Protein backbone atom coordinates (compact mmCIF):
# COMPACT_ATOMS: atom_id res chain seq x y z
CA UNK A 1 0.00 0.00 0.00
CA UNK A 2 0.85 3.74 -0.53
CA UNK A 3 4.00 5.01 -2.47
CA UNK A 4 7.22 3.80 -2.22
CA UNK A 5 10.43 5.38 -3.83
CA UNK A 6 11.72 3.13 -6.64
CA UNK A 7 15.47 3.08 -7.12
CA UNK A 8 16.40 3.25 -10.58
CA UNK A 9 17.60 0.44 -12.27
CA UNK A 10 14.87 -2.56 -11.05
CA UNK A 11 11.37 -3.22 -11.97
CA UNK A 12 8.58 -1.31 -10.60
CA UNK A 13 4.44 -2.48 -10.09
CA UNK A 14 1.79 -0.12 -9.58
CA UNK A 15 -1.82 -1.41 -8.22
CA UNK A 16 -4.84 0.12 -9.07
CA UNK A 17 -8.68 -0.04 -8.95
CA UNK A 18 -11.08 -0.09 -12.09
CA UNK A 19 -14.92 -1.06 -12.86
CA UNK A 20 -14.55 -1.71 -16.23
CA UNK A 21 -14.71 -5.06 -17.96
CA UNK A 22 -11.47 -6.76 -18.55
CA UNK A 23 -11.88 -8.20 -21.65
CA UNK A 24 -13.57 -5.46 -23.59
CA UNK A 25 -11.77 -2.35 -22.21
CA UNK A 26 -8.23 -1.77 -21.65
CA UNK A 27 -5.67 1.24 -18.78
CA UNK A 28 -3.24 3.12 -20.37
CA UNK A 29 -0.74 3.91 -18.25
CA UNK A 30 1.53 6.73 -19.35
CA UNK A 31 5.02 7.44 -17.35
CA UNK A 32 6.56 10.98 -17.69
CA UNK A 33 9.88 13.10 -16.25
CA UNK A 34 9.83 16.59 -14.76
CA UNK A 35 10.01 18.28 -17.93
CA UNK A 36 7.13 15.90 -19.22
CA UNK A 37 8.58 13.99 -21.69
CA UNK A 38 7.63 10.43 -22.24
CA UNK A 39 9.69 7.90 -20.32
CA UNK A 40 7.72 4.86 -20.30
CA UNK A 41 4.22 3.48 -21.59
CA UNK A 42 2.49 0.15 -20.63
CA UNK A 43 -1.19 -0.92 -21.03
CA UNK A 44 -2.99 -3.96 -19.44
CA UNK A 45 -5.98 -5.70 -19.48
CA UNK A 46 -6.27 -8.49 -17.21
CA UNK A 47 -7.76 -8.31 -13.82
CA UNK A 48 -10.29 -10.86 -12.29
CA UNK A 49 -12.59 -10.06 -10.16
CA UNK A 50 -11.62 -8.48 -7.61
CA UNK A 51 -10.83 -5.30 -9.60
CA UNK A 52 -6.76 -5.26 -9.13
CA UNK A 53 -4.83 -4.66 -12.11
CA UNK A 54 -1.25 -4.83 -12.03
CA UNK A 55 1.37 -3.20 -14.42
CA UNK A 56 5.02 -3.21 -13.81
CA UNK A 57 7.76 -0.58 -15.54
CA UNK A 58 11.32 -0.53 -15.96
CA UNK A 59 13.35 2.16 -14.39
CA UNK A 60 16.65 1.29 -15.84
CA UNK A 61 17.01 4.51 -18.25
CA UNK A 62 15.04 6.28 -15.40
CA UNK A 63 16.13 9.81 -13.73
CA UNK A 64 15.93 11.18 -10.32
CA UNK A 65 13.14 13.01 -9.59
CA UNK A 66 9.42 13.44 -8.93
CA UNK A 67 8.15 11.41 -12.05
CA UNK A 68 4.19 11.78 -12.97
CA UNK A 69 2.42 8.45 -13.65
CA UNK A 70 -1.29 9.02 -15.58
CA UNK A 71 -3.54 6.10 -15.74
CA UNK A 72 -6.35 6.28 -18.61
CA UNK A 73 -9.58 4.00 -18.68
CA UNK A 74 -10.79 5.85 -21.79
CA UNK A 75 -13.30 7.80 -20.01
CA UNK A 76 -11.08 9.52 -16.73
CA UNK A 77 -7.62 10.31 -16.07
CA UNK A 78 -5.80 10.23 -12.54
CA UNK A 79 -2.67 11.25 -12.14
CA UNK A 80 0.15 10.40 -9.77
CA UNK A 81 3.67 11.54 -8.66
CA UNK A 82 6.41 9.12 -7.60
CA UNK A 83 9.97 9.97 -6.40
CA UNK A 84 12.67 8.17 -8.50
CA UNK A 85 15.55 7.69 -7.11
CA UNK A 86 19.38 6.26 -7.46
CA UNK A 87 19.19 4.16 -4.15
CA UNK A 88 16.69 3.63 -1.46
CA UNK A 89 17.08 3.84 2.36
CA UNK A 90 16.55 0.09 4.12
CA UNK B 1 -12.90 -21.62 -26.91
CA UNK B 2 -14.85 -21.82 -29.94
CA UNK B 3 -16.83 -24.92 -31.71
CA UNK B 4 -18.30 -26.03 -34.66
CA UNK B 5 -21.52 -28.68 -34.89
CA UNK B 6 -22.47 -30.60 -37.22
CA UNK B 7 -26.50 -31.11 -37.70
CA UNK B 8 -28.52 -34.32 -39.14
CA UNK B 9 -28.39 -35.07 -42.57
CA UNK B 10 -31.59 -33.43 -44.13
CA UNK B 11 -32.13 -30.55 -41.72
CA UNK B 12 -33.09 -27.34 -43.13
CA UNK B 13 -30.76 -24.16 -42.13
CA UNK B 14 -33.53 -22.40 -40.85
CA UNK B 15 -34.94 -25.27 -38.64
CA UNK B 16 -31.62 -26.21 -37.70
CA UNK B 17 -31.38 -23.43 -34.91
CA UNK B 18 -33.68 -25.64 -32.69
CA UNK B 19 -32.69 -29.55 -32.34
CA UNK B 20 -29.05 -30.54 -30.52
CA UNK B 21 -26.21 -30.98 -32.40
CA UNK B 22 -24.82 -34.04 -33.89
CA UNK B 23 -21.78 -33.61 -32.86
CA UNK B 24 -19.57 -30.99 -32.53
CA UNK B 25 -15.73 -29.94 -32.72
CA UNK B 26 -13.83 -27.29 -30.48
CA UNK B 27 -10.75 -25.27 -30.54
CA UNK B 28 -8.89 -22.17 -29.01
CA UNK B 29 -8.06 -19.33 -30.76
CA UNK B 30 -5.41 -17.00 -29.41
CA UNK B 31 -4.20 -12.97 -30.76
CA UNK B 32 -1.60 -12.30 -32.56
CA UNK B 33 1.52 -10.22 -31.50
CA UNK B 34 2.49 -7.55 -34.13
CA UNK B 35 5.38 -5.62 -33.60
CA UNK B 36 8.08 -3.46 -35.11
CA UNK B 37 12.28 -4.76 -35.56
CA UNK B 38 14.22 -1.74 -37.31
CA UNK B 39 12.86 1.89 -35.93
CA UNK B 40 14.06 1.98 -32.65
CA UNK B 41 15.96 3.29 -30.29
CA UNK B 42 18.32 6.28 -31.92
CA UNK B 43 17.62 7.67 -35.19
CA UNK B 44 19.24 10.46 -37.38
CA UNK B 45 17.09 13.18 -38.38
CA UNK B 46 16.50 13.22 -41.95
CA UNK B 47 18.30 9.77 -42.99
CA UNK B 48 16.56 7.07 -44.79
CA UNK B 49 15.74 3.84 -42.55
CA UNK B 50 13.64 0.86 -43.35
CA UNK B 51 10.75 -0.72 -41.97
CA UNK B 52 10.10 -4.36 -40.99
CA UNK B 53 8.46 -5.99 -38.53
CA UNK B 54 5.33 -8.94 -37.94
CA UNK B 55 2.24 -8.55 -38.44
CA UNK B 56 0.42 -11.92 -37.43
CA UNK B 57 -3.20 -11.78 -38.19
CA UNK B 58 -3.19 -9.15 -39.99
CA UNK B 59 -3.17 -8.23 -44.02
CA UNK B 60 -2.25 -4.54 -43.98
CA UNK B 61 -0.57 -1.95 -41.50
CA UNK B 62 -0.29 1.30 -40.47
CA UNK B 63 2.43 3.63 -38.66
CA UNK B 64 2.09 6.20 -35.92
CA UNK B 65 3.93 8.45 -34.35
CA UNK B 66 2.97 10.12 -31.17
CA UNK B 67 4.07 12.68 -28.34
CA UNK B 68 2.36 13.61 -25.28
CA UNK B 69 -0.59 13.51 -27.21
CA UNK B 70 -2.43 11.56 -30.17
CA UNK B 71 -0.93 9.19 -32.83
CA UNK B 72 -0.50 10.73 -36.01
CA UNK B 73 -0.40 9.33 -39.40
CA UNK B 74 2.78 8.66 -41.61
CA UNK B 75 2.25 9.24 -45.24
CA UNK B 76 4.34 6.15 -46.63
CA UNK B 77 2.50 5.40 -48.97
CA UNK B 78 -0.78 5.95 -51.31
CA UNK B 79 -2.87 3.94 -49.51
CA UNK B 80 -1.12 4.47 -46.39
CA UNK B 81 -0.80 0.92 -45.65
CA UNK B 82 1.53 -2.27 -45.88
CA UNK B 83 0.89 -5.66 -47.06
CA UNK B 84 1.72 -8.45 -45.33
CA UNK B 85 3.15 -11.98 -46.91
CA UNK B 86 2.21 -15.39 -46.23
CA UNK B 87 4.90 -15.37 -43.63
CA UNK B 88 2.76 -12.84 -41.34
CA UNK B 89 5.74 -10.36 -42.11
CA UNK B 90 5.61 -6.70 -43.39
CA UNK B 91 8.30 -4.58 -44.73
CA UNK B 92 8.90 -1.23 -46.00
CA UNK B 93 12.73 -0.20 -46.65
CA UNK B 94 14.10 3.17 -47.24
CA UNK B 95 11.76 5.37 -46.57
CA UNK B 96 12.57 9.24 -45.18
CA UNK B 97 11.19 9.62 -41.82
CA UNK B 98 11.29 13.37 -41.39
CA UNK B 99 10.45 13.65 -45.63
CA UNK B 100 6.60 13.41 -45.34
CA UNK B 101 3.62 15.36 -44.91
CA UNK B 102 1.99 14.30 -41.78
CA UNK B 103 2.38 15.78 -38.56
CA UNK B 104 4.22 12.67 -37.40
CA UNK B 105 6.62 13.60 -39.81
CA UNK B 106 7.06 17.31 -38.29
CA UNK B 107 7.36 15.97 -34.84
CA UNK B 108 10.06 13.38 -35.84
CA UNK B 109 11.97 16.42 -37.90
CA UNK B 110 12.68 17.75 -34.32
CA UNK B 111 15.44 16.40 -31.97
CA UNK B 112 14.30 14.48 -29.17
CA UNK B 113 12.32 11.77 -27.85
CA UNK B 114 9.24 10.17 -28.92
CA UNK B 115 7.13 6.92 -29.57
CA UNK B 116 6.36 5.33 -32.90
CA UNK B 117 3.81 2.80 -33.06
CA UNK B 118 2.48 -0.02 -35.45
CA UNK B 119 -1.46 -0.69 -35.81
CA UNK B 120 -3.53 -2.89 -37.82
CA UNK B 121 -4.98 -1.12 -40.88
CA UNK B 122 -8.49 -2.70 -40.49
CA UNK B 123 -8.51 -1.62 -36.58
CA UNK B 124 -7.04 1.95 -37.61
CA UNK B 125 -10.41 3.32 -38.99
CA UNK B 126 -12.76 4.40 -36.97
CA UNK B 127 -15.42 5.52 -38.88
CA UNK B 128 -16.13 2.81 -41.86
CA UNK B 129 -13.31 4.62 -44.01
CA UNK B 130 -11.88 2.76 -46.69
CA UNK B 131 -8.42 3.92 -45.90
CA UNK B 132 -6.12 4.15 -42.61
CA UNK B 133 -8.02 7.18 -40.31
CA UNK B 134 -5.34 10.37 -40.01
CA UNK B 135 -5.26 10.76 -36.11
CA UNK B 136 -5.96 7.82 -33.63
CA UNK B 137 -6.21 8.98 -29.59
CA UNK B 138 -4.50 6.91 -27.00
CA UNK B 139 -7.75 4.60 -26.12
CA UNK B 140 -7.65 3.91 -29.99
CA UNK B 141 -5.00 2.94 -30.71
CA UNK B 142 -4.48 0.93 -27.43
CA UNK B 143 -7.74 -1.30 -28.25
CA UNK B 144 -6.93 -2.43 -31.32
CA UNK B 145 -3.82 -5.04 -32.06
CA UNK B 146 -1.04 -2.64 -31.50
CA UNK B 147 2.56 -1.76 -30.59
CA UNK B 148 5.42 0.91 -29.68
CA UNK B 149 8.51 1.43 -29.52
CA UNK B 150 10.74 4.44 -27.62
CA UNK B 151 12.19 6.55 -30.52
CA UNK B 152 15.24 9.20 -30.29
CA UNK B 153 15.97 11.51 -33.03
CA UNK B 154 18.85 13.20 -33.18
CA UNK B 155 21.18 15.99 -34.74
CA UNK B 156 23.29 15.45 -37.88
CA UNK B 157 26.82 13.91 -37.31
CA UNK B 158 29.83 15.30 -40.33
Known sequence: AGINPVATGETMVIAGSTNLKPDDNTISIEVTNEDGTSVALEDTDEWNN???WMVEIDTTDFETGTFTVEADD???????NVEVV???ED | EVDLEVYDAGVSATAAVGQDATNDITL???EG???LSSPTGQYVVGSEVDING???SSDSVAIYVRDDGDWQLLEIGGDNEISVDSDDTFEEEDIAL???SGDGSSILSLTGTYRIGVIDASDADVGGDGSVDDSLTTSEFTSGVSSSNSIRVTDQAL
Request: hydrophobic share 15%; net charge negative.
Open chain 1, 50 to 52: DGQ
Open chain 1, 74 to 80: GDNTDTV
Open chain 1, 86 to 88: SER
Open chain 2, 28 to 30: TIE
Open chain 2, 33 to 35: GTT
Open chain 2, 54 to 56: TAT
Open chain 2, 98 to 100: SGL
